[PDB]
Structure formats: structure tokens, C-alpha cells
Design a protein around this ligand. Structure first.
Ligand SMILES: *[C@@H]1O[C@H](CO)[C@@H](O)[C@H](O)[C@H]1NC(C)=O
Lengths: 49, 127
């Protein structure tokens, strides 16, 4: 297929690409410590007028 | 230093309005539930009204319910007390006090501990 012919002469030919495939995915980020103070808004004891 | 300055006093006839103002300076005004407490002349104290950290009022005194109207403003650090149906029995000093426990610092949210007190005004009514 690479030579675009059916008769191939004696010799060494370089054809294609060997490339090992990935296994899975990885995502990294440190311990999530900051947190928006939402509860104080929704869970407040008394809302304004 | 923490400062609580109130203004609005002066003789007004019965059946009018007034608008007392308390301004706070020296702390994060949005983590402290304010209170307005009267002080009759030569008598004991008497709770009047309050307001929580989120501008939500916490009810008024039983004998005053119907006229007083509290309001807050965190942007200008200002708490206001509109007063209606003024009658002779409403002459007294008025302090604006602040709570102690900062909100979410430990069950429920805090409202006790009137610790810092400004020097009150001298509202009076007569004809
Ligand atoms: C972040 O969480 C991991 C997993 O619970 C823990 O091992 C680590 O001690 C935490 N953060 C640090 C670096 O203390």
C-alpha cells in the first residue's frame, strides 16, 4: 500500500507509525478549602422585607 | 476604635414622626445584629427593637407594636428607626447596641450580648 505497487523488491522499507495509546484520564487540583458562604443566605433565620 | 453615634432628638408635639439614626464606625457592620433600646427617665431599661445580620427584623416590644419601623443599610453602615403615632409616654433616652458573637462562629444564629453602647439621645414629647 505504501509503495503503491503489488510487486515489492527485496529490501527494508519504513511504513507506518507505532504509537502506544493512553489508558484513562487524570485531573488534579489541591484540597478545596475556600467555600462561598451560601448557607448563611438561604438558611438565614430571617430574610429582609 | 468602635464608635456608635446616634442623632435625631428634639422636642416634637404628640401625633407626628421622627427618624432616629445610629451610625457605626470601627468594625464589619454586616456581622453584628444591632438593637435599639429605650431608657425611660429615672427608670429601668426596656427593649424596643432589633435587626439581625441580614437586615431581617426580629420583632418589636409588645406595647410599641404598630408604629415603630426599623431599617438597616450595610452600604452606609447606618441603622434607622422611623417612629409614628408619637405619644407623651414615649419620652426617654435611646441607645443603639451591638451583639457580641459574629455570625457562624458558634445551633442557631446569635442575637444576645449588647456589649458596646453609644450615648443616647434625649427624645421628648409635649405640648
Ligand atoms: C487533602 O486530602 C487528601 C485526601 O483526603 C489528604 O490525604 C491530604 O492530607 C489533604 N491535604 C493535605 C496535603 O493535608
Amino acid at each position: 500500500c505504501t509503495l503503491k505497487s503489488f510487486t515489492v523488491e527485496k529490501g527494508i522499507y519504513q511504513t507506518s507509525n507505532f504509537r502506544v495509546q493512553p489508558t484513562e484520564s487524570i485531573v488534579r487540583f489541591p484540597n478545596i478549602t475556600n467555600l462561598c458562604p451560601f448557607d448563611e443566605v438561604f438558611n438565614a433565620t430571617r430574610f429582609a422585607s | 476604635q468602635v464608635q456608635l453615634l446616634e442623632s435625631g432628638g428634639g422636642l416634637v408635639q404628640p401625633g407626628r414622626s421622627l427618624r432616629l439614626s445610629c451610625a457605626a464606625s470601627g468594625f464589619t457592620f454586616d456581622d453584628y445584629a444591632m438593637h435599639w433600646v429605650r431608657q425611660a427617665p429615672g427608670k429601668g431599661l426596656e427593649w424596643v427593637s432589633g435587626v439581625s445580620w441580614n437586615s431581617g427584623t426580629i420583632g418589636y416590644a409588645d406595647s410599641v407594636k404598630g408604629r415603630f419601623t426599623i431599617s438597616r443599610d450595610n452600604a452606609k453602615n447606618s441603622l434607622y428607626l422611623h417612629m409614628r403615632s408619637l405619644r407623651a409616654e414615649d419620652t426617654a433616652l435611646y441607645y443603639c447596641a451591638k451583639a457580641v458573637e459574629m455570625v457562624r462562629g458558634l445551633g442557631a444564629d446569635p442575637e444576645y450580648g449588647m456589649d458596646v453602647w453609644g450615648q443616647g439621645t434625649t427624645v421628648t414629647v409635649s405640648s
